[PDB]
Specification:
part of a larger assembly, 6 chains, 172 residues, mainly alpha, binds sodium ion, binds zinc ion, metal binding protein
């Protein structure tokens, strides 16, 4: 047992390790999306920049969870980072919809983590999740929903002009 | 024989003279394209600026090859600069596709030059080509491919609105 | 076939995808090492900082390879990022020795990639590897060898005072 | 007929195209001279700089004529740029004398162009020629005549010391 | 075997040691030349400055090769630095011609080193030579050839006025 | 006889040439030491920096003696620079002891030179030696003796921790 460990349940430690893997997976998905939009036959540089930024953000989220795991005296156990579901993301609108799905999945995992911390009476972990992850997820989901709505209203994915102008004016 | 000449094959000297002519020809092609887009019945000022910039860049490439020829003790032999294949470049998309074709032709010539320098065991010439021309060509080809992709997706050449907005937002 | 693809062999494209996976794996290994040294029962903050910096550097190397893959018209195919070989890295000296082993493995992969590009007469790829990866690997290997030498001479891993003072004076 | 064309005779349009070719030819001649003086067995860097500057100036003159052609609604028709008469320019004095001959040829062409514009009652073209080309040619011819006079008086081409000191003190 | 050594052939290590000695020898030759021109009966201060600068440059080249030898895990073996061939360098023109000969000798040694590294499939060593030595040698040879050409054309060595004015205007 | 030579004995001229060779030899010894400490299996960067600085200082001493030789109208005669006695300097303490021995040898040579200049009634040479070399040698010897004393008291060469901390705190 770690000399710093206090009120940190083994179930919470395991769930934090699972969340670390999920954040690294999300980082990998976003990296794949970014370099899909960097292809010469897609060529939407601001979509690529947006998703690269999201990938780095998700890496930071994972690293903050690893720091938490050490702060509480738990032990980090890493697992394989599975490859993303797609190599070809088909369009800016499709990539935004997949990103929305992924962010809602990550949010659900975080809500289950908060429920577990509440059940184990771990207020520090509950506060950590609320302070650093929950409103970040709500804001990310709202932003992606806005992007999806605007692309659809502009005529994406059928309008390449729609995705070009969205790349310029919203993501630029 | 030049007092500075060392490990510089006559075949390499001839191929450098051929490359000088090819770069000057590319400069002339781009100059023609630029002033096509400066016509009152075409009137795409940022296409004109883009191609004028490319023309000056190709002139600089030719001058760097002439400097190399003198540095190695070879002798520059200039030839006629042939007129470009077109007077009317028909559209921004067509001009970008022709520019892509031209840059791939110049790249192929440079790869043949590198093969010759490798065969003649001229590492200074190989390094010169790699350092100053090969990645420049790869970047130029990727940029032109991106431009072609975006124009096609926006609906060029049938959409004059597409070429207008591309002129404003990508080339502006 | 990509509109930008020129002198880019399918074998080279596959080897670049393998190298991308290897760089991401190295990033993951370094991330694991960093947060091992962030544990309360290890508590070497400058070892943790060093390895976190290396992890971000390896991510950048992977992203540069993905950019190259797109520049040449190849297609990125991502694979699972396997978990690192260890969860517990045992000591600063042991982690440095493992890092040296990993960097020499990455260097060997890059040398095989250069041999393949030479065999396929791809001077742009050869130059890319030489310019951005080979001297970086040589410098990294020399630095890690220096660190290992100094830790051993100071008495690591048996001297915790040795690793403490190395953390302060070399990595701080 | 161009929507902007007014009081622009077809003969004037043809003569402007001929002048464009002549200016590009002069640019090429000066480029050849510059890199003759960049040879290791000639090695007069300020002669090389002088003639490179003249080459870029002549390119600018050609581009201004192309802009005029478009401003008036004429159509640019480019022709081959013939190679310069010499590969070896023999001396600084000989190159200056050839440059003087070339500038007087260009001036004669411009005077014939002005005569044509006067005959066609095209005051805008007459003013354009007078404002941008005629005094430039007179100044260039006077400068080259001064250079030739000084080189001859100093003892060029027989005095290599003469050309060395002229390179340093007049062109430097 | 060094813990950092990888893909570094013993033949390459020996050739690098030979090149180190050759660079130190060149530094010594240039030092001798510099202080020849510092004599009261020669008294060409800018020739002296030029050759002193070259001597320090060659020392830097040798030190960079020693750094490379250590970076790759080879072992430096130093040898005697032989005295220069002359104590009296006879004139500025003669010293420049000897310097040109020496730089071409060093260039030939570097080309043989590059051939050896290519034969041993050592791309890091090939790139090191190309990046840091080959174009430096080509530029140095071209500069010395230019200096020799100008001195000869000015009338050196028979004209002491020629060497005086060259010292002032080219080397000053 | 030089037009500037006055009260400069041939014995003094010969002894100055011998001292020039000795200073160049000392520079070479220090260069060898520096790059011994740059090895990956020694890895004491501040020892390497210290000895590289000493090597450049000894080169400067040699050049000042060459300047003196020319100032007095003597003629510089260079000899081979013999290789240093060791390739492997075994430890920081051993290298410092060898440096102390070398500096005392150079000091003895300078004292013999001063005795010769006194015997030949050459006060300018005596003053030159006193002003530029004698106190420099005394200070260098005292500094090296201090370094040796501290390394021994810290437990070098048996304590690698001793040499590591000396490298950091005294030489850093
Ligand atoms: Na997952
Ligand atoms: Na395409
Ligand atoms: Na979902
Ligand atoms: Na959804
Ligand atoms: Na849900
Ligand atoms: Na051509
Ligand atoms: Na083509
Ligand atoms: Na094409
Ligand atoms: Na091709
Ligand atoms: Na791997
Ligand atoms: Na503990
Ligand atoms: Na290994
Ligand atoms: Na190893
Ligand atoms: Na290996
Ligand atoms: Na003409
Ligand atoms: Na010559
Ligand atoms: Na004429
Ligand atoms: Na004339
Ligand atoms: Na006339
Ligand atoms: Na030699
Ligand atoms: Na005299
Ligand atoms: Na030679
Ligand atoms: Na020669
Ligand atoms: Na040779
Ligand atoms: Na000695
Ligand atoms: Na001694
Ligand atoms: Na002693
Ligand atoms: Na003594
Ligand atoms: Zn513990
Ligand atoms: Zn791109
Ligand atoms: Zn996240
Ligand atoms: Zn954070
Ligand atoms: Zn902990
Ligand atoms: Zn635990
Ligand atoms: Zn694990
Ligand atoms: Zn997925
Ligand atoms: Zn697609
Ligand atoms: Zn709690
Ligand atoms: Zn909290
Ligand atoms: Zn909102
Ligand atoms: Zn010649
Ligand atoms: Zn080009
Ligand atoms: Zn350039
Ligand atoms: Zn030349
Ligand atoms: Zn030739
Ligand atoms: Zn010709
Ligand atoms: Zn064409
Ligand atoms: Zn048209
Ligand atoms: Zn070569
Ligand atoms: Zn080069
Ligand atoms: Zn718009
Ligand atoms: Zn494609
Ligand atoms: Zn890497
Ligand atoms: Zn990068
Ligand atoms: Zn692509
Ligand atoms: Zn493919
Ligand atoms: Zn896949
Ligand atoms: Zn591992
Ligand atoms: Zn442990
Ligand atoms: Zn290639
Ligand atoms: Zn490249
Ligand atoms: Zn029209
Ligand atoms: Zn003109
Ligand atoms: Zn202008
Ligand atoms: Zn027009
Ligand atoms: Zn017309
Ligand atoms: Zn035509
Ligand atoms: Zn001509
Ligand atoms: Zn000539
Ligand atoms: Zn008019
Ligand atoms: Zn008038
Ligand atoms: Zn006007
Ligand atoms: Zn003068
Ligand atoms: Zn070793
Ligand atoms: Zn050198
Ligand atoms: Zn250097
Ligand atoms: Zn080493
Ligand atoms: Zn060895
Ligand atoms: Zn030896
Ligand atoms: Zn010599
Ligand atoms: Zn003499
Ligand atoms: Zn290698
Ligand atoms: Zn190569
Ligand atoms: Zn390298
Ligand atoms: Zn004398
Ligand atoms: Zn180092
Ligand atoms: Zn000294
Ligand atoms: Zn000094
Ligand atoms: Zn003297
Ligand atoms: Zn004498
Ligand atoms: Zn001698
Ligand atoms: Zn010794
Ligand atoms: Zn040793
Ligand atoms: Zn005296
Ligand atoms: Zn004195
Ligand atoms: Zn003291």
């Amino acid at each position: 047992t770690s000399q710093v460990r206090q009120n940190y349940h083994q179930d919470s430690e395991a769930a934090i390790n699972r969340q670390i893997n999920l954040e690294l997976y999300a980082s990998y998905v976003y990296l794949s999306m970014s370099y899909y939009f960097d292809r010469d036959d897609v060529a939407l540089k601001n979509f690529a920049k947006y998703f690269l930024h999201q990938s780095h953000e998700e890496r930071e989220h994972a690293e903050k969870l690893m720091k938490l795991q050490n702060q509480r005296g738990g032990r980090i156990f890493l697992q394989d980072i599975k490859k993303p579901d797609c190599d070809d993301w088909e369009s800016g609108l499709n990539a935004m919809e997949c990103a929305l799905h992924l962010e809602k999945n990550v949010n659900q995992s975080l809500l289950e983590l908060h429920k577990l911390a509440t059940d184990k009476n771990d207020p520090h972990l509950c506060d950590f999740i609320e302070t650093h992850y929950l409103n970040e997820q709500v804001k990310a989901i709202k932003e992606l929903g806005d992007h999806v709505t605007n692309l659809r209203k502009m005529g994406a994915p059928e309008s390449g002009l729609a995705e070009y102008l969205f790349d310029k004016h919203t993501l630029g």
